[PDB]
Design a protein around this ligand. Structure first.
Ligand code: FKY
Length: 272
């Protein structure tokens, strides 16, 4: 069952972003949580109102209700009092993980912080894998950053897709055969790892979309980032086995990252 929010409980304050789908606003929502009379929330308003989109909306709302985890962006409910159709989410003040990485990179984040970021993304992916859920578009741009470096996995909907697919995050079987699995999500996490330790640099930045496709399908691996300890690079490479059956489990990848997250390796980006 999907929770319904009364329109006059939502008070729109500021547009946070926009795409083809519609708009995202910062808002104050009343009668949502008991201790909080007024609390901040992220409101997604959808452009289309037609039944083809309206049924697709409820479908999304249902799935969003069923996904409940610490590192998955919280869905609070819906407002189906005509057009526009509203979707309420928790407020993540720092926005997407890609922009946060670039803006807190060459104060810049430390080894322990980047590992805290990585482990949090792995935790959410473990949750997803457990439900047999395939994200298909895992990347830092789809992760959100809240108060006190709390990282959650979400999903938005520009030059990051070829004709459309985020090829640079995709393994060969997904590029060639269009097959997205739990194993293809592990490959993506490996690329998310590269992105974290490069402070949000685009995978294969020295290459074009078409050139990168040939580079991935031939089995070329992204080089070890300067800020990346070799223990973390081993984790990435394990996510990048040509054979999906030979790629590590996300449960395992998280376990290894969590070990480093609590016991940070004595590493310095300068010496190598
Ligand atoms: C400049 N700037 C500063 N802050 C912002 C900002 C912009 N947008 C935000 O909210 C958006 C972000 C995208 N989004 C999802 O991620 C839904 C969603 C999909 C899938 C899923 O499940 C899955 F895939 F993870 F399993 C979970 C969840 C809808 C909505 F929340 C927020 C903000 N949240 O405050 C903050 C922009």
């Amino acid at each position: 069952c999907v929770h319904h929010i009364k329109r006059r409980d939502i008070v729109l304050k500021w547009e946070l972003g926009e795409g083809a789908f519609g708009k995202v606003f910062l808002a104050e929502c009343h009668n949502l949580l008991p201790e909080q009379d007024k609390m901040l929330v992220a409101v997604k308003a959808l452009k289309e109102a037609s039944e083809s989109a309206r049924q697709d909306f409820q479908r999304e709302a249902e799935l969003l209700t069923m996904l409940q985890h610490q590192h998955i962006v919280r869905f609070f409910g819906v407002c189906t009092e005509g057009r526009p159709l509203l979707m309420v989410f928790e407020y993540m003040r720092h926005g997407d993980l890609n922009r946060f990485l670039r803006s807190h990179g060459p104060g810049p984040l430390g080894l322990g912080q980047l590992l805290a970021v990585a482990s949090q993304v792995a935790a959410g992916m473990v949750y997803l894998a457990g439900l047999h859920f395939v994200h298909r578009d895992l990347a830092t741009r789809n992760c959100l950053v809240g108060q006190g470096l709390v990282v959650k996995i979400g999903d938005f909907g520009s030059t990051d897709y070829y004709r459309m697919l985020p090829i640079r995050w995709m393994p060969p079987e997904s590029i060639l055969y269009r097959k997205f699995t739990t194993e293809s999500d592990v490959w993506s996490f490996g690329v998310v790892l590269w992105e974290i330790f490069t402070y949000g640099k685009q995978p294969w930045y020295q290459l074009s979309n078409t050139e990168a496709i040939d580079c991935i399908t031939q089995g070329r691996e992204l080089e070890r980032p300067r800020a990346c300890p070799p223990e973390v690079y081993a984790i990435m490479r394990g996510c990048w086995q040509r054979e999906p059956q030979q790629r590590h489990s996300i449960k395992d990848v998280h376990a290894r990252l969590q070990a480093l997250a609590q016991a940070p390796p004595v590493y310095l980006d300068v010496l190598g």
